[PDB]
């Protein structure tokens, strides 16, 4: 697998801590993205470093950074993380956003929930409310108190099956995501599943579903070096080897 480290800007310049590891024996590689650079070699793990520790960059995929650049949240926006855990999309949001506004970052796992806030905290994330509950049930509370969201990252992950219902559950929680959308609101639904009833299938199920939403085009052109281009439906986009395999779709509340 290729490795990738995203800068974190709510700390530290990119170019800055690209000479700081530089000067350790890392060897680091441009990519479409000031703040992203591919790990060619490093003498020690990329996660053992003080600087990581210090929260001056997320280790991820390149893959992985899509999802909340497709979100392209503004630093006032109100959005909800629906399935957080651990975190690198919810922080790589409130860097896009400077810290500034809100996310509301779900994850039903206690022990996750952990992880999610240890990344947080570590990359000095301030925007973020973490509530650890069940999509399904905390719908419920936010309709309920009118707290409609600007734009929501449905991100999946690829009882036991609550623990994993964000793997199971897209469909159902696609909808919720809708339901929970400001009118032009938008939703990117994302995941590093390939499965045949969790892509292009989750995008047809709402479309069909709602008579309140429809497909934003996701164009492949800014992602340069990324092995990106279209899924089966127009304007969803599916990232190949050797990046980390990853389907991505974007929707806006009408």
């Given at each position: 697998?290729?490795?990738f480290?995203?800068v974190?800007?709510?700390?530290?310049?990119?170019?800055?801590?690209?000479?700081?590891?530089?000067?350790?024996?890392?060897?680091?590689?441009?990519?479409?993205?000031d703040?992203?650079?591919?790990?060619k070699?490093?003498?020690?793990?990329?996660?053992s470093?003080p600087?990581?520790?210090?929260?001056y960059?997320?280790?991820?995929?390149?893959?992985?950074?899509?999802?909340?650049?497709?979100?392209?949240?503004?630093?006032?926006?109100?959005?909800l993380?629906?399935?957080?855990a651990?975190?690198?999309?919810?922080?790589?949001?409130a860097?896009?956003?400077?810290?500034?506004?809100?996310?509301?970052?779900?994850?039903?796992?206690?022990?996750?929930?952990?992880?999610?806030?240890?990344?947080?905290n570590?990359?000095?994330?301030?925007?973020?409310?973490?509530?650890?509950?069940?999509?399904?049930?905390?719908?419920?509370?936010?309709?309920?108190?009118?707290?409609?969201?600007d734009?929501?990252l449905?991100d999946?992950?690829?009882?036991?099956?609550?623990?994993?219902?964000?793997?199971?559950?897209?469909?159902?929680?696609?909808?919720?995501?809708?339901?929970?959308?400001?009118?032009?609101g938008?939703?990117?639904?994302?995941?590093?599943s390939?499965?045949?009833?969790?892509?292009?299938e989750?995008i047809?199920?709402?479309?069909?579903?709602?008579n309140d939403?429809?497909?934003?085009?996701?164009?492949?052109?800014?992602?340069?070096?990324?092995?990106?281009?279209?899924?089966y439906?127009?304007?969803?986009?599916?990232?190949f080897?050797?990046?980390?395999?990853?389907?991505?779709?974007?929707?806006?509340?009408?």
């Open positions: 697998k290729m490795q480290i995203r974190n800007t709510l700390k530290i310049n990119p170019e800055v801590l690209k000479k700081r590891l530089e000067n350790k024996g890392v060897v680091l590689e441009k990519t479409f993205l703040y992203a650079f591919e790990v070699k490093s003498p020690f793990s990329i996660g470093t600087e990581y520790l210090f929260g960059y997320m280790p991820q995929s390149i893959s992985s950074m899509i999802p909340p650049i497709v979100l392209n949240p503004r630093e006032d926006d109100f959005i993380d629906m399935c957080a651990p975190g690198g999309k919810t922080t790589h949001l860097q896009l956003m400077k810290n500034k506004g809100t996310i509301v970052a779900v994850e039903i796992s206690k022990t996750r929930t952990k992880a999610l806030k240890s990344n947080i570590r990359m000095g994330v301030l925007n973020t409310i973490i509530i650890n509950a069940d999509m399904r049930k905390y719908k419920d509370y936010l309709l309920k108190n009118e707290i409609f969201f734009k929501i449905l999946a992950p690829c009882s036991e099956e609550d623990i994993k219902y964000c793997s199971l559950r897209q469909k159902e929680l696609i909808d919720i995501g809708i339901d929970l959308l400001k009118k032009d938008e939703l990117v639904y994302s995941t590093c390939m499965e045949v009833e969790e892509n292009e989750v047809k199920y709402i479309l069909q579903k709602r939403v429809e497909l934003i085009i996701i164009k492949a052109n800014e992602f340069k070096g990324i092995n990106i281009k279209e899924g439906i127009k304007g969803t986009l599916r990232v080897p050797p990046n980390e395999p990853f389907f991505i779709a974007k929707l806006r509340k009408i």
